[PDB]
Design a protein around this ligand. Structure first.
Ligand SMILES: CCCCCCCC/C=C\CCCCCCCC(N)=O
Lengths: 122, 122
């Protein structure tokens, strides 16, 4: 769900990383507006989209099957919206590692007026 | 959207308040499994359930219209799902205020093991 995405995060992020994703960019953690200030914060957008597209079932509450073969991410059964959900997180969690180098603390807990600009479509 | 939402919490339940729903209980913050704990937790959950009902929109990424009628959150003349999403965020919000003292600091942060159970139904 999100409890997982978290562990799914920590997993490929060395435990206590989700904390750095509590409130980032215009999309990360609490957010949803203007344009993605950062690629990492863009990782977020996706995940939001990814979920946003998901047909019918609830993610915040969706409980799925996922594993970590050799410290690496792997989603279980390839059937159901769950296939989908477990995907975002995977990717997401991953997209993270993909840009952990471009992380701007100065982008932590920003303010609305930071993203007040026009939205940006998925 | 979270932001919109965020504000609400800062609004009705003072500032910095948000930071206290960042994570707490099986359903507040990052979570989504097992049964709730007390009240506050329930407050969230439903929201999630509320978010759960909705369709054709993304509560994370939606952007409704709200405002405090000088003292209490109020979702103004709507046009669709926003109508809802707002309301969702709206009450869930009021919902917290409805049970402040009941807050239990030690319920903020569970190992996702404190909930290790099956998410109930909406
Ligand atoms: C690729 C990055 C992923 C996008 C960012 C995901 C961050 C998750 C945000 C949601 C959890 C924050 C707490 C709000 C949830 C409280 C739920 C309740 N019903 O209000």
């Amino acid at each position: 769900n999100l409890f997982q995405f978290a562990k799914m995060i920590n997993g490929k992020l060395g435990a206590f990383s989700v904390w750095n994703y509590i409130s980032y960019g215009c999309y990360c953690g609490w957010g949803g507006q203007g344009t993605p200030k950062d690629a990492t914060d863009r990782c977020c957008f996706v995940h939001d989209c990814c979920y946003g597209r998901v047909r019918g079932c609830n993610p915040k509450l969706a409980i799925y099957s996922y594993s970590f073969k050799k410290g690496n991410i792997v989603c279980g059964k390839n059937n159901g919206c769950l296939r989908d959900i477990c995907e975002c997180d995977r990717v997401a969690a991953n997209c993270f590692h993909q840009n952990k180098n471009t992380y701007n603390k100065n982008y932590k807990f920003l303010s609305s007026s930071r993203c007040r600009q026009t939205s940006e479509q998925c």
